Design a protein around this ligand. Sequence first.
Ligand code: HEM
Ligand SMILES: CCCCCCCCCCCCCCCC(=O)O
Length: 463
Amino acid sequence: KLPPGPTPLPIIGNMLQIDVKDICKSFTNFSKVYGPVFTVYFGMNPIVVFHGYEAVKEALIDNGEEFSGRGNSPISQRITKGLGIISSNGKRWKEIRRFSLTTLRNFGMGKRSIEDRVQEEAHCLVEELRKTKASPCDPTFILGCAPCNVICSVVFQKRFDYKDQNFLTLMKRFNENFRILNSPWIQVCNNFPLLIDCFPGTHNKVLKNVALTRSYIREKVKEHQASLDVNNPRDFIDCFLIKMEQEKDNQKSEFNIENLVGTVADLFVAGTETTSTTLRYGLLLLLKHPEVTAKVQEEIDHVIGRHRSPCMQDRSHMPYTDAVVHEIQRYSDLVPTGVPHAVTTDTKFRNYLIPKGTTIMALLTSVLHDDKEFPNPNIFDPGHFLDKNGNFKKSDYFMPFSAGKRICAGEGLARMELFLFLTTILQNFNLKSVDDLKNLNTTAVTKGIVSLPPSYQICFIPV
Ligand code: HEM
Ligand SMILES: CCCCCCCCCCCCCCCC(=O)O
C-alpha cells in the first residue's frame, strides 16, 4: 500500500497542486497535512516523498540497500542509455561505482595526487582573478572554469589552458545541457513524454550536445590507449583501460569502452556545475558577510601563512573555515529535493509498501533546514557548525551530498575543491561589493532541481 497523499485528478495527477517553480515549498506544505512520508502523482507516475531527518535517515541509511536505486526518467534514459554511474543500476552500478571511488581516492590515479591537481588549478584560478585588475565582474564564468578543469585534469591527465578552444566548447557544451535539463519544463516532459515534440530545437540541441561530447571523449580515449604505460597510470582514463584489459575473458563485465565514455561524461555532469554553483554561492556569502570572511582570513594567515598554498591538512587546524564551508553548502541547499531514487524491490516502510521501481524523493532541504539542529535555519551563520569553544561541531543532519549507499561519488573531491579554492582565493584577495551590502540579498532562486544564487558583481582586491 502507498502512503497517503493529495487526491489525484485522472491524467495530470497532482501537477496542479504543485508549484512547479518552488516545488519544494509544496512538498513542505503537504508534510503539514500528511506527515513524514506521503505520495504525490506527476501525471500517472507515483512519487513518494520523504520529509524530515527521521524519514530521510530511515529510508536512505537504515533501509539503504532497498532505496539505493536511482531515478530514471524517459529523457535521462535516452541520453545516458543506462550507462555510467549516475544513471546506471544494479550490477552495472556497483561494479562501476566501486572502481570509480577507489580511482578517485587522493592517490588512486598514480604518482600525482588529486590534491596536487586542485592546488595547481587554485593557483591558475587566482591568476585569472588578478587579471580582472580589481574591477567589478561576474565571477560565474571564471569560477566555472576551475571545477570543470579539475575534472579535465582528473580525466585526461593534463589541465586545459583557459583559452584552449577545445576547453571552451567542451565546457560551454556541459553548461548548456545543464542549464536546459535544469528547466522546470523537463519536469513536465518526463511525466508527459509527448511534450518533447513541442521543443524540437531544445531537444535537438541536447542530442547534438551529447553526441559531440561523447564523440570527443571517444577520440580522447583512443589517444590514451596508443600511449598506455600500464606499469604506472596517468589518470582516470588509464585506470579504466587497465581494468578493461583483465576482462579479456568476462564479456559481460561492465568494463568496456561504452561504459568508459559514459562514466567520464558523468564525472563532468556531476562534478562541474555543482561545485561551480557553490563556489559561486560561497563567495556571495563571504562578500555579504565581511566579519566572517575576516575570521577565515585570520585563520588562513595563522595556520598557512602568506607564502605556501593551502592544502587539505590545514582543514583539521582551521575549525572556523570548516564551518564556513559546511554552512555554505547547507545554506546553499544546492539540490533541495535530492536526486530522484527508486526502490530495488517491493519495499515496506513503516506500515506502507512501495512497489519495486517507484520514484523516491528524499527531501535534503528538510534535513538541512531542520528547526532544532540549526536554530534559525534560514540565516547564514557558521555557528550552526561550532561548539561553545569554537571547535568544529559535526552534524548528522549534514546531507548536502545525500546519505546512504548512493552518496555523492565525489564527496572527497567536492569538499576538497570547495576548501582549497575558497581558502586560496581569500588568501590572495579581499572582496569588495559594487554597492552597499544591505543592497545585497542572498536569497536563492529555485526555478528548478538545482537552486541557484542570484546574479551579482564582485571586486577581487588583492592586498
Ligand atoms: C559541492 C559539490 C557537489 C555536490 C553538492 C554534489 C551532490 C551530489 C548529490 C546530492 C548526488 C546524488 C546522491 C543521491 O543519490 O541521492 C550526487 C551524486 C554524484 N556525484 Fe556529486 N556533488 C558534488 C560534487 C561532485 C563532484 C566534484 C563529482 C565528481 C566525481 C561528483 C560526482 C557524483 C557522482 C558520480 C554521483 C552519482 C553517484 C551514484 O549514483 O552512485 N559530485 N552528488
Ligand atoms: C525582448 C524579447 C525577448 C524574447 C522573449 C521570447 C519569449 C518566448 C520564447 C519562446 C521560446 C521557444 C523555445 C523553443 C525551444 C525548442 O524549440 O525546443
